[PDB]
Structures are given as C-alpha cells and as structure tokens.
Design an enzyme around this catalytic site. Sequence first.
Site, short mmCIF file in Angstrom:
data_model
loop_
_atom_site.label_atom_id
_atom_site.label_comp_id
_atom_site.label_asym_id
_atom_site.label_seq_id
_atom_site.Cartn_x
_atom_site.Cartn_y
_atom_site.Cartn_z
CB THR A 74 52.79 -39.61 12.18
OG1 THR A 74 53.67 -38.54 11.83
CG2 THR A 74 52.71 -40.57 10.99
CG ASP B 226 59.87 -31.09 13.50
OD1 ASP B 226 59.22 -30.05 13.78
OD2 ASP B 226 60.09 -31.45 12.32
CG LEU C 161 74.89 -29.33 5.93
CD1 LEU C 161 74.50 -29.09 7.37
CD2 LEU C 161 75.88 -30.48 5.78
CE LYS D 241 56.89 -36.87 12.28
NZ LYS D 241 56.81 -36.71 10.80
N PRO D 242 60.09 -41.89 14.52
CG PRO D 242 59.91 -43.63 12.99
CD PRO D 242 59.20 -43.01 14.16
CD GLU D 243 59.37 -40.08 8.94
OE1 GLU D 243 58.50 -40.65 9.64
OE2 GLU D 243 59.15 -39.76 7.76
CD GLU E 188 64.93 -38.23 8.87
OE1 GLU E 188 64.29 -39.19 8.37
OE2 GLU E 188 64.67 -37.03 8.61
CG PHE F 76 60.44 -23.95 6.49
CD1 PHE F 76 59.40 -23.30 7.16
CD2 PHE F 76 60.43 -25.37 6.47
CE1 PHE F 76 58.38 -24.02 7.77
CE2 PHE F 76 59.41 -26.09 7.09
CZ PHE F 76 58.38 -25.42 7.74
N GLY F 77 63.51 -22.87 3.41
CA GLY F 77 64.74 -22.37 2.82
C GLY F 77 65.78 -23.47 2.71
NE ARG F 78 69.71 -21.42 -0.48
CZ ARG F 78 70.50 -20.35 -0.34
NH1 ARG F 78 71.51 -20.37 0.52
NH2 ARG F 78 70.28 -19.26 -1.06
#
EC number: 2.7.11.11
Lengths: 493, 493, 349
Positions: free
Chosen positions: C234, C217, C82, C201-203, C160, C87-89
Amino acid sequence: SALACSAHALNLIEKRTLDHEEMKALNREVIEYFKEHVNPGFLEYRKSVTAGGDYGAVEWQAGSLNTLVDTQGQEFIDCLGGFGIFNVGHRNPVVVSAVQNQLAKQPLHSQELLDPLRAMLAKTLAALTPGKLKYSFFCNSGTESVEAALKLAKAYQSPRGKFTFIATSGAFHGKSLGALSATAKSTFRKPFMPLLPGFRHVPFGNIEAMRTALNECKKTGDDVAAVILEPIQGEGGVILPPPGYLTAVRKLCDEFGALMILDEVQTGMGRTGKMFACEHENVQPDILCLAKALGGGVMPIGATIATEEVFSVLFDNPFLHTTTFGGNPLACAAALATINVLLEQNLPAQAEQKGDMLLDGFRQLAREYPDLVQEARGKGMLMAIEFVDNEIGYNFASEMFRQRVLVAGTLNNAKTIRIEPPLTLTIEQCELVIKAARKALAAMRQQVAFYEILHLPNLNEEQRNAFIQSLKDDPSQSANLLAEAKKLNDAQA
Amino acid sequence: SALACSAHALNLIEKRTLDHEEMKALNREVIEYFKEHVNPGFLEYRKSVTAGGDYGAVEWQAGSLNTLVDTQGQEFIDCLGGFGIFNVGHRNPVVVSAVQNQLAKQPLHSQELLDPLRAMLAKTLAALTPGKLKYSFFCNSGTESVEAALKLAKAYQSPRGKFTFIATSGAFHGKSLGALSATAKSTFRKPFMPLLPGFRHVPFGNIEAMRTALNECKKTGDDVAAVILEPIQGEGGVILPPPGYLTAVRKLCDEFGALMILDEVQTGMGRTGKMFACEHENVQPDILCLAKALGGGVMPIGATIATEEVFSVLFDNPFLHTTTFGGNPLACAAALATINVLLEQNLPAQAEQKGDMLLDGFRQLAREYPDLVQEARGKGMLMAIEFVDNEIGYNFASEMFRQRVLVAGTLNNAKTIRIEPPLTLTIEQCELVIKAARKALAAMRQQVAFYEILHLPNLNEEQRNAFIQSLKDDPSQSANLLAEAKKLNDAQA
Amino acid sequence: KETQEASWEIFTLPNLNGRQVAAFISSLLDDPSQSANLLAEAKKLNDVQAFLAKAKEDFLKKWETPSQNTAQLDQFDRIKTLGTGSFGRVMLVKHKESGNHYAMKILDKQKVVKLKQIEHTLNEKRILQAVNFPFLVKLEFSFKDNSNLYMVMEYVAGGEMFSHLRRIGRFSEPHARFYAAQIVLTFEYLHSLDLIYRDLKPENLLIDQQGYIQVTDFGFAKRVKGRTWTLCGTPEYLAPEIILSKGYNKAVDWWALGVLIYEMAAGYPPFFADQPIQIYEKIVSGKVRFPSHFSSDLKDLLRNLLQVDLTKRFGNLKNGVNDIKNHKWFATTDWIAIYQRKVEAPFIP
C-alpha cells in the site's frame, strides 16, 4: 617364572573341588611356601599344623554361615569368627550380592568424582551412632581406624596446648606405629621403641587411677589431649570393666576438656548384645573407631566417626588426612549390607541370648573342672575361658580343633582362650560346641591325672599299674582313681 | 532410621541405569550428605563440583578399561588412574573374575588355617622381585606398607644400636603417624606433631647430602637405622633423581650398614616402564613397599617384601607384626590376576612407548605455550605438567575435566598437575588427550591474554575494544592481538 | 575483581559476537555499579539470539519438505459461514475429535487460476506451514480435494486494527508502544528466517481474544536472501527504495513500522495525499513533519526509522534490531514479557 606361579594360583582359584592327591599336592606347596616366603614361625606356633594331622589344615572355602571346609573336606564350626570379623557369618548371602552387584558397576573410586556410596555410609553411620557423632572417615583396617582417631584428637587438641594421651594397660589398638603407641602389651611394643612421645598407661577399670593421671599431667603442664580405651579389653583377655566405669570416664574427660576415644573395633557391630558396646551405659564418645565386622567378613574396612565439633578440623583442608583405598565403593557396599542384615534379622538381640546361653554353659563346665579352669567370662558373643597354664590352654584350643571346632589360642599365648563365634550361630551348633568342650575337658583331665599317677613317688609300680589299667578302661574314673592313688601314695608316705 | 538409609543405598547398588530425575535426586543427596557427614571441604576444593556444572560429577560406573561414566551418562577418559591405582584399567575382565571366583569360595580367611593364596602371592612376589627379596608381608594400603617396613627396619636395627631414619624432602610415604614421620611436606605433618622421634630429612637426588647426614649421625652416636626413599617422588611433583642416584644411595647404605627401604607404592607394577622402577638402575633394596596397583583397581592391598636377613626378625615371634585383614584371599586373588595380566599383555613395555609418546606430546605443547607452562616431565606412564601458577594449573585440570578428560589437581594444590592414565590407554585415546590439552591450553591463553588487554593503562577503550572484538571473533589471534595491544600501549606510554 | 568476574561472564557468551561483548565490557568498565545489570542484559541478549537459532533450524526443516493433507473435510462440522471473498468463503468449524473451533478458508481452485493467484496461494501456504510465532496467525491444518483448497486457521475474535483505529481515532503513545513492540519482535523473528513481510498495514493486523496482535496476510511475503524488486503493498507504507525501482530488502519492513507507528499515534499516515502518484513524491523527498503532541523521543525514533538513507536507517545498522529495542522510546517495554503475553493489554475487544 612369576608368570608361571601366577597362572598356577590363578587356575586353582577356578577349581572348586579337589582329588585327594590334588589335595596332598596343594597342602605341601602351601606349607613349603609358608616356610620360605611367608613366615616359618606360623608353622611352629599355630594350631593348624601342630594338630594338623598328617597334613595341615589348609583353608578351602566357606561351609554354611558358621562352617569352614579345608582342602580335605573337613567341616569346622567357627567359634573364632576371625577374632570378631564374621559377625554375620561366612559369605552372608545378603552381603555377598551387595558386593557382587557393586563389583559389576565400579569396584574402586576415581578419587575425583563424588562417589555416592561413601555418602550413604557416612549417612547411615550417623543414623546408627549414639548422640552427636555425625562425620565418618573411612580407612581400611582397625589400626588405620585408631591412627586417624589419634590424628583427629591431635589436630583438635594441639592448638589448645594439649599433647599427652592416656591409654590403658592391656589395651590393644593396632600394630602400626601410631596405634602401637597406645596398645599396651610389652611384647608388641618393645622392639620398635621409641614410639610416639607422650603416651601414658593407667590400669583398666580404675577411675580412681585415671583421675590421678589426668590431674598429675595437669599440674606438670602436660595436659591430656585425649583418653583412648576399649569398652571391653578383647585381646586383653575379655576384661570387663566395673559397671559405671565408661560413664565415669566420660565425665572425667568432660571435666578436664579431654577428648574421649572409644575403640569399638572388636565390640562394634552387635557382638556384645547392643549395636555398639557403649550403649549398655549409654555413653557417647567424641570419637568412635570401627572395623572388622563392619566389612561383613566379605570386605576389609575401618570407620572413624566423630562429633562435628571435632571433625571440623579436617573441613578447611580436607586433604590433611586422606587414604588411597578408604571408602571405596565395594567396601562401602559390604558395610551397608552388613548394617542392613544386623538391623533386619536383628542380630544384636540374637547375640545376647546365644551369648548368655553359651557363657553360662562355660561357667558350668568351669565348676566341673576347677582344676583346669580358673574362670570363664564374656558379654554377649564376645567371651573367653581362662585356664591355669598356657600348657593347658593350648591343649584345649587344640583338642577341639580336632573335634572340628575352631577356637583361639596359639602355641604360647594361650592361657586364656577366646570364644567369638558368628552372631548367626544356630542353637544346634551352640550345643555341639559346649559338648565338644566337655569332651575336650574330659580328655585333658585324663592326661593331667595320668601324669599325676606316675610321679606319685611313695606309690609302687604294682599299684600304679592298677590305676593306669582302670584309667584306660574307664576314663570317667580319671578323678576317682586319681584320688585313690593319691590317698594310697600318702598311705606309704 | 539406619535401617531405612541402609535399604535405600542397598537398592541403588542394584539399579544399573537412571532416569534423569532419578539422577537429579541422587546428585542432590550425595552433595547433601557430603556436606553433612563426609566433609564440606571436598565440595569446596574439588574439581568435580567447581566445574561440575549444574550438578556435580557423581561417579556411577566404569565405562571401558580407560573410561568412567557419571550419573548423567557423561563418559570420562581417566588420565589420573586413581593416582597410580588403575594400572590395568577399570574392571580389567581378568582381575574381576579372579575376584568373583574367589568370592564364590571364601572372601576372607579364618586366621587359623593356612590360607593358600597368601602362599601363592608370597611365592610369586619372590619370583617377581629383583635380588634376594624373598619374604612378603601383606597389609591393606600404602601407608600400612611403609609402617611395616619401618617396623622391620626397627626390629632389625635397634638390637644393633641404630635408631635414626633418613627420609627425603618432598617425599610422601603415608598419612598414618608412623609413615607421616618420614613423609615430608610441612602442611601434612605440622598439626599432628610431635611425630616419631629420630626422623631426619635430606634433599632428594643429592648423594653429597646423604653422605653428610649418615656421617654426622655416625659421629654424634645417632647412627642411621635405615634410609627410605621413593625411586621417583610422585606426589612430590614427578621429581626424577639424577642418573646413578638410587645406585649410589644403595652403596652408601651398604657402607654404613643402614637398611635401604624403597617406596615403590606409586612406581610399582609397571608404571615407569619396568615392573619396578628400581630395575632401571638394577638396584636391590633391603625392603620394598608395594600397594595401589597391586590390587588391580579391584581390591585394596599392600605388600612389604624383604630379604631373608631382615625378615628373620619376625620368625621367632610371628605375631609381633600382624594385621587383621592383611593377605585376605580375595585381595590375594586380585593381585595374582594383576600380576598375570601385567606379564601376559606385557604392559610395562606398553608403559614405555605410550609413556614417551604422551610426554613428548606434552613437552611439545610446552614449547608452544611457555607462558603457561614451565615444564612437562615423567618416566613411563607416570608424568606431570608444571604450570606457573596454581591459578593456571587448576584452570588446566578443570578445563579438561569439562572436555571429559579426568586429570589431577585440586583447587589449591594445583601448580603441577599429574598425568597417570591406565597402562591400558589406547593410541586412539592417547591423542584424544593431547588434543584436549591443546584446546585447553588455547582457551586459557585466550583468557590470560583477555585480561592482559584490559589493564593496559596507556591503551584507550576505543583501541581495547577493537582487540576484544577480534579476540572473540578470532581466538587464534589471542597471541597476535595481544602483542599488537601491548605494542600500542607502549606507543602511548 | 568483582567487576572482572562479570566481564569474563559476558565474554563467555557463545551467542554474542565480538562487537556485542565488547559493548557490555565497555559499559562495565565505565559503570562497575551496573555490573549485574550489564551482565544481565548480556545474558538476555545471548539467550535471545540463541533461540533464534532453534527458530531457524525448526523453520528450514518445515520449509524444505512441507506438510500436506494434515486433515480431511469430514473431520469437521460446519457451524456458520463467517465471510466470503473472491477466492471463496471462510467458515467457522468444530473439530469433531476435540471440539475446538477454527476459521477454515475454502478457496476454489478454478477461481484462483482465473484470478491468476496460483503463486500467492502456494507461497502463503508454504510460509504459513513453516512459520511459528505468537503474533502470527497459525495454520493448524491444510488440505485439498477435487474442487478446492482448504486452510484451517486458528479462529480469533476481534476486528482489524484499521477499523478499530477509526473508532478511537488515535492511540495514546503507551497504546501504540504495546502494538509496535509486538510488530518489532515479529519482524526480528521473520528477518532471521530471511523473510521480508512486505505488507504491513492496519488491515493486516487482527486483535487477539487476549487483546494482543495477530498478523494475517502472507500473499506478498518473500524468502529473500539478497535483494528483490517486486512492488506490492500500500502506497503509504512503501519505502522510497521500492518506489525508486532500485533493489530493496528487509530494511523496507522497518520503514513500514515507522509509518505504522506514526499512524497509531497521529490517527493518520505521515505521507498522505488525495492521489497516490503524489504520495510517492512526498515519500521520496522524505520530509515528515510531526503533530504537536508527538513526544520528542517518539520523534527521534520516527526520524530514525523513516529515513530514505537506508544506510542510516534504524534496523539496518550493525546492531540491527537492537537499535530500536534499546531506543529511548522503548525503555519502558519488557520485550520477553511482551513475548510471553504476560503484559496487560491496553484494550480487549
């Protein structure tokens, strides 16, 4: 000590069989105590001691469904059934375990928490009872049954200005002061008078009479609250009312706005052929009294079932009529067991075929000895033989006692004897009974004849002796030799 | 069908535990039936449904000797003891096996053969009872008890020209028409009037009064047959008579040749400290009524014990007063078991120490909440707390119900509550009870105070809110905040 | 009397304090007409808080001794890759036993150690492992081997909120009300477990297949009892207390909600400048002038949440969360129904 006496009786409960002197021991205490703590009279008037033998016939334990075994091991056929108690026999296995189960859980209720078996019984009885009979009250006996009935009728009818109660002559309804006001025999009532005011008796089976009572009372401003009667007068001598009577009483009541109370204490639970005797004419009372056989000979119980219109009285103040022990769980158990058995092995239907084979069997015997019996009568497994004398009657009831067949009658009240064996009486025991009564009727006829030969005044000793001789050598000729002696006594007249 | 309903209730007897929806199922039928076949009223006025919860508290089975477990598994401490029934606790192992033994042999008698256990009980009771009380009659309940007593007195006294009966106001003696003539509460009597003629009530504990009744009746030619009273008015609210009263009644009777009848239906079998309450003043009556606890909470039973002089009436015609189920073997069993246990583990003596530790425990609580309790009172394990309102009283009886402690009182008749736990109540359960009543008394005082704070009219919402705040945060200050609010409401007055 | 019955019922509520009940009694005393509505609300409140009790107990149990290796790598079948991070995937996977789909996150042990991210990783996992709420991402499985850590996450298709907000530009106040209400309940929940979120935050706001929100998160979230000082987040969403370097607490989350609402209704954040240091200036002396199309009720709530005086901030008063749940802008929102997910989504991706 009382501690002492308790234990000795407690260990005896545990004992299941007896050494012959363990027996002798027992029977002598039991007679001794009956004389000094119970009643000495029961030792005078009961057939268990008069015809007891060397010892009385003290009860021990149930035999089979229809048999009873005393402390000597003698086994009796119960043609009394505790005066209409043992309808499903002694210790009916289905009732005894329903009781013993309920005994493992909770024998009596707390009286605060909704006890489930009293609902279930109230429900079942609603189902089992004809027409609009819906609510059941539960008490402990047949007398408490009728009392509550009287109380229901009262609480219903007094706001409507009706206080008088018609009952019937010959009626039995209970020995407690309230029921004893409706019970009718002189003997039972007189010492305790004055009883409840406003109870008036009319002849049984007489609709022409009961109209006049209901009407006279109307005219004089003493209007009738309720009429109370048994479908058959049981103790009253197995009196059958004329066909149509119960139906005609039912209208008469409806016409004068009087409640109809049916005392099915001794004809309830399938004895007469139907589950309730009032079903033969399909009559629905406002109140129905039940007891005796409702407790499957295991438990004591009384039920009072009524229409909603009438039982409503108790709704607004449910504590108006309570009883302490009424409707307790293990009594409930017993009835549901009894109600189940009666519908399963369908014993009302048994009652009618055994009840006619027997009764016919008696009115045959009754043709063969018209000199000792006026008549036999009954309806299903409630029946009675009427003799000519109390002398003779107690002689019948007593004679068969020794033939180990247990029937009614006491030393004095014994002119008419009642036959009420369990509805579970086998066809084998059925004959054994009519047989025993035939032997009995023979032996009495012998003795009756025997005296007859002796006061023959014109007859000399020489002749009298010849008859007495052939009498003992041939009891069968008791009728012939008699006729020959009477014919001879008239020859010298 | 009735066959259907019988079986469903029959299988439920067999079941010993329940799935939670097997429970739900049950409780809804049992409520449903109670409404349509038993009484809808018991659903209105009983504490088992008002405080029932989501479901009512339907009985299931006995827990320990002192505990009861409903269909949800909730275990209750019985401080009711079936209103003086469960004196030796629920399912006392010694009584249950005496019953189950006797059940294996013969549950009820034939009524013709001398039944041995009725002698043994008649004997034991003779032993157990003070003075010349010798003969026992056996019936089924407390009401049948008194009825026979009335009948004995009657049959004795009417040949001597004495018909009037003095009873006492507040007295309870039975709900059957005969006993209801001596029972005294207005409510219980009025609908069924007219009752037995010639019953006159005097105030209880008043020897000065009873002299005047006995004397007035003498003067007017209506001489008193018998005086009937309870040693303590039990239902009457645990009324204790003045020391010397029962003794002084006993002479007064002897002076006017009137029989003395003692209704020890609720104070018999060791509840008050002695085996019979009439032993505290060592008084011997002519007649003694027993029931309730005589049947060890297993069986229903009533006994009427009398002097020989009086019971003689029944000797010459022993059938004058019978009952169908009275003295049946397995009821007998139960009593001898109960009589044995009571003398063995010597529970009258237990009754007095637990009976004072408790009662003192209540009159302490009674000092701490004089605003909710007028007084506590009792004698041995018969005791009662008197509140100020029926409102409050039903609130106490109900509150503790939820604390799983089962006490008396119904929705309306609840001003005075009665505490009657089994004589086998442990010292551990003894505190658990006084503790539960303390919590209960707290919570009610909270609610009482709560309203008090709200109709304080001079007090504004701003202030009232501060109190309600600290009330919920500190229910202990329910008394303090109250006084502070009342003191504040008077400041703005 | 009829009123007195409802009064007692309100006081009998164990979950409600003296303050709460005394508030329902007053309104009753003053409005015997809304007796049923006042007793109703009281019952909602009681019930509502009661559940928070079961939520905390259930949290601590998991927070105290956490789950480990609830799965292994050879229980899944790689479908597609995806996305990739530092960090990786992240890969889309199919659970062989069920056929269910997840977004597994592979993160290289050695790559994390370099990026100095050991704590964040551990803290995020331990939080996620213990947490349970509809509007939070659900860590279904978690494990590791020699080479990397594995976080198996419930896959939810939908972008997002950030990028989505760019597309529409600004949301209509009913649209923003729907998103706010979810963030509110989420925050109620998390605060109950003494957890600051610290990264709103929107993200960090993904959209459900159902159009509802998922919060994504947790590298920053802290189990804080009293006060903390670590600044992370942020610039636009920092409460003045963070900047000012005086300790802060869970109040900070409520500020950020304010900023987040403002942005959803305005299409831009209230404190915004080209360069940050400057964004801080504008935050500290917290003058926030609204757009013209902003509802006065929406203005009232924002004046309350965006409040430098953290003793005067909606969220940290005595009624706490209830203050903005009962605010005039939130009268038209059924919180429990929002919770059930039985509310019509304004948008489905």
